[PDB]
Design a protein around this ligand. Sequence first.
Ligand SMILES: CC1=C(CCOP(=O)(O)OP(=O)(O)O)S/C(=C(/O)CO)N1Cc1cnc(C)nc1N
Ligand SMILES: CC1=C(CCOP(=O)(O)OP(=O)(O)O)S/C(=C(/O)CO)N1Cc1cnc(C)nc1N
Ligand SMILES: [Ca+2]
Ligand SMILES: [Ca+2]
Lengths: 620, 620
Amino acid sequence: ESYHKPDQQKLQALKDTANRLRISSIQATTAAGSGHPTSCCSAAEIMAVLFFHTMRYKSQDPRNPHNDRFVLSKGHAAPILYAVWAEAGFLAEAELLNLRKISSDLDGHPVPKQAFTDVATGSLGQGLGAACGMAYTGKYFDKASYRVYCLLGDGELSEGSVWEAMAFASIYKLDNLVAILDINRLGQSDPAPLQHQMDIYQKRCEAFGWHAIIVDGHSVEELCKAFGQAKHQPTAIIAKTFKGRGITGVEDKESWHGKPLPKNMAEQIIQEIYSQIQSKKKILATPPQEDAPSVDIANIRMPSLPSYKVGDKIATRKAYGQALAKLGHASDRIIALDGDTKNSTFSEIFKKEHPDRFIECYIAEQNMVSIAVGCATRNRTVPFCSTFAAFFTRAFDQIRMAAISESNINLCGSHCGVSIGEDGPSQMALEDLAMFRSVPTSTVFYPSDGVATEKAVELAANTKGICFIRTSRPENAIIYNNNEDFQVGQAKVVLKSKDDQVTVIGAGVTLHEALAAAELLKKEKINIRVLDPFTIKPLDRKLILDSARATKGRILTVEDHYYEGGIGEAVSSAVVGEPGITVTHLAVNRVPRSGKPAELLKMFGIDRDAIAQAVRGLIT
Amino acid sequence: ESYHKPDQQKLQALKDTANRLRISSIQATTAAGSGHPTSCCSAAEIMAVLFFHTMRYKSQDPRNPHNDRFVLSKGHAAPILYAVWAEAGFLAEAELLNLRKISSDLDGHPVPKQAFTDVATGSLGQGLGAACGMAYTGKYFDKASYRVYCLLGDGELSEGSVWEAMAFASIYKLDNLVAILDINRLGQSDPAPLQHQMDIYQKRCEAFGWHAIIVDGHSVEELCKAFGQAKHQPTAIIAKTFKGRGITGVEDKESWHGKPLPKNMAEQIIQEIYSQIQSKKKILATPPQEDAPSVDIANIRMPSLPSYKVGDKIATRKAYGQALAKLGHASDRIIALDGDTKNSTFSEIFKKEHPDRFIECYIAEQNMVSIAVGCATRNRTVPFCSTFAAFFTRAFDQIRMAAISESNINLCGSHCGVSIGEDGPSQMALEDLAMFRSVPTSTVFYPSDGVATEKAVELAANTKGICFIRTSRPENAIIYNNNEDFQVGQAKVVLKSKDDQVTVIGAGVTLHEALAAAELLKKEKINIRVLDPFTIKPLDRKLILDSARATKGRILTVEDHYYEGGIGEAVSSAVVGEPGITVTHLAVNRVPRSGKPAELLKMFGIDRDAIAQAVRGLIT
Ligand SMILES: CC1=C(CCOP(=O)(O)OP(=O)(O)O)S/C(=C(/O)CO)N1Cc1cnc(C)nc1N
Ligand SMILES: CC1=C(CCOP(=O)(O)OP(=O)(O)O)S/C(=C(/O)CO)N1Cc1cnc(C)nc1N
Ligand SMILES: [Ca+2]
Ligand SMILES: [Ca+2]
């Protein structure tokens, strides 16, 4: 646990290592014909000191739960990440030359198909949030000794998501977290705004509650000392570096971001760098203290059936909070995150019952999703984050990168559609189905009553990928019995007869408007089938088609969402070309406005009267 | 003009005004049954001083181009915004009681159907970026004397987008910009992280380059003085306030965010506040100096037809930069914004030729979109912002709010799809069509060669709403004559014969792969019709169906995008139910990986060979 103060030979070996990492970054990107060797070279001493002096990890088991974590937030330096894992003996050195090949897993940016990568980066400014999740988990959940190290670029620090993470780390006293800032003066197409004004970087980090140390980022000695000192808060190592360090004629120059060296130049430069290496002997990694606890990864089962009665009224947003609190007794892995909306999403119910597993993320949806991604790495927790579904659009890039990260997180967005009423469109989620459907690993739950909500929470907990649960503000009736069985991809027909003339597909509030339309239409001797998709993605194509063939081929979809990318388009895409099938679509056609929930459902054509009129038109 | 130091009577009139604004905020939200009176009451003195001492504006012409701008970033304080415009004589006082009614335009959050509103807020943390665009426009484009004032909440300051705007304003020396921070200690569901640690707020603002002044937010005299001194930096007025100020039993208490007072309580409280008001006489607004220049509203036309040659190769990303710079020579209203990607999007070409109208926004896509929205308010500029299309997902909430703001901005996202090759999925836009199609005011251009790209830039300049242009990295052949006519909503049949067996719909790289497939298929005596949509939204439904009816009803869509919300689903939703029409859909089915562009097109089943195989399967 004591700092090992390195001797001159260890320091020279660390320099030798840094220069090997430079050579490999050049060799790999020259072989590929693309990549970012100058972004690797500014970080070479940082990487050498982190992996071969400061960090503790099992070199043959990069995912080991006891290891220190490293997050390469500036992911385009991936070639030097691969180089250090070859230097540590995990990767074959020859494989480095296959960078970016379709036959290789050493892809252009890091991805979790690599055993040594937890989260995909590549979209700048997201790695520190993931690192915050890992550090929060290490400190408060695992209660383990591992530390978390996150390397960022300086242009990258213009992303506001970084400063959300900075503030989070100081609020939650993440003394096990270190950010290393590669202040190499340059971004992609110009100098970074602050260039080498190291004092301003320090003042910004200190103002956000971090211990901030300015170092020469090419001094292995200064780096060892800065990483070695006792930590009492999150620590920012602010490293003055030169982009392309060590590449004569390219160091500190513009016009070289993302440009590989041509073969003739790479050969000449590599010879120069090799001439500075004093010994070929490599440093060994040092293994960690193994105090991370075992975690139970068994299937998660609610401790009891939902306790609703048909006819009771409850909003699905409230049912979500009740279900999540119940799920917290079913598994110790469940954690909840929310962005200062816990009294609106009803995640406050989980906080009341399991306060040690609730993370207040404040008004910072970007960071919230990244925290959850970090908490889910190495399967340590099962995260449920919540806010208004509208404000998950604030975090779409984090959610997009979460799927590239093959992350298992759960996201519950409330207040969907116009049915929230008087707040108006800024709070109305009308594009969240389009957004989450376009996330390739996503399962999209749209529970229509309290029972379906509790079952969706339970299914989501056991479902891999990006799970989204769309909850609602109006208090609708329970329609399902408590022992109704639900499955991903299985819809429910909630009203049917042999004389049905249309299959009406609704969800949430429009499912209940469809049921109300059915009772109205029965007064005119018109029966309609009513179908509740349960999951919008994957869609129950078979039950939808079987239903439509029983109702003269006619489908009517009605949704509290815009036309594009929602339920209607999902259904149309599933059934197009099937003989005799037709699809009519009722949705919200423009930015809405303030009014009572029922008034807005009417104004935008998705209430019981609009459904009934649409049905009448189809018959005639 | 000299500061008019107010006398005691002016100060008392300002206190009276603040208390009138409290009373109205309470009356309106109690009448509506919803809203945020405590969030209004913390800002009452700020609002009184801004509108009736500091700012200069035409009370009967809120949109007037010479006016100071006010941005209510904490938009849920909308009732006090409405109250000040009634106090200024623009709104009828009786109409304030109709807050949130479907019969009123005094909606739950501010929206541009209100003459006194430029940008919709309601999604927190976006107003300061819009204000930065307004101030940048005032200082560097209009070169006018108007100032820009933006009121934020303290919980709101957790949004990273705020800090992007803070940094933007100091980089660009926006000394005409004032941020007022309503530090009322509380957010929605808990205290804000920093509560009343005023010194920490000052340190953070100063570290980001702002002149930061702490004031008693309920002292009209301190506010008059703090607002009365212009600075050489953007100025942060850090106002210590109490939430619900002036409401006995509620001031400084939790559990009251977004809670209206019950009628009996509102009556009692209003009587107490009214007893503090010394005079009913109202202060008059003071008008501005009228030095904003006139702006032409005429159609913008390219100075000449495109000058490409059929057969020449150019990537549409480069054609975009060439076309944008060309358009810049025809109209001085065109401005360009980019997020440190100008060498990759080729917006650098516009920077080279029109540097005064280029805005480097650095690696901060949220703020970039908000800057563009602010620059487009009152039609002062015609903005084109650009980055990789994948990174516009970082700004989806800003884009969503831009449509609620009825904003006319143009967005060009490059590097779409797997055809970028070796960088891998973090850089690959595969959900941008889903995203932008779900924005209700959007027009989605997907140009397939350099000619179509120049035409799309020109059309976008003259089209209202959220215009998106999707550009690509491969260097594909010019296929259109320079004099080909292009229109929004009109597709192009680029290959046909009387013996066509399928209509193949492709765009960008998949249009060219479809043309290559047609050549492979002709060796098998199979002709296919090939259709280029040009705009994905709106879609040329008529030409698609007329084509399909000439090709045995058969449509095949192939796209470098995920399945959901893209070209295939747009087509299927347009044609579903049409007799005899069938649609086969080829898209990217999962997160991709690194390889050469041609290798990835083949791996993910959207290259010429996958297209030909699909055609062969349909005919059988
Ligand atoms: C602009 C940019 C880079 C420059 C980063 O500069 P830096 O100072 O943070 O790092 P180094 O100087 O250490 O390179 S790497 C890059 C890519 O597309 C490659 O990922 N991009 C475009 C980019 C834009 N926006 C986001 C959100 N992610 C990105 N990757
Ligand atoms: C959390 C939250 C508010 C608290 C604002 O606290 P503050 O300290 O900034 O301002 P005041 O104390 O002055 O009220 S108002 C708000 C609403 O849904 C209403 O728009 N929400 C939800 C919310 C969450 N996230 C976003 C991006 N916007 C929001 N509007
Ligand atoms: Ca840099
Ligand atoms: Ca507050």
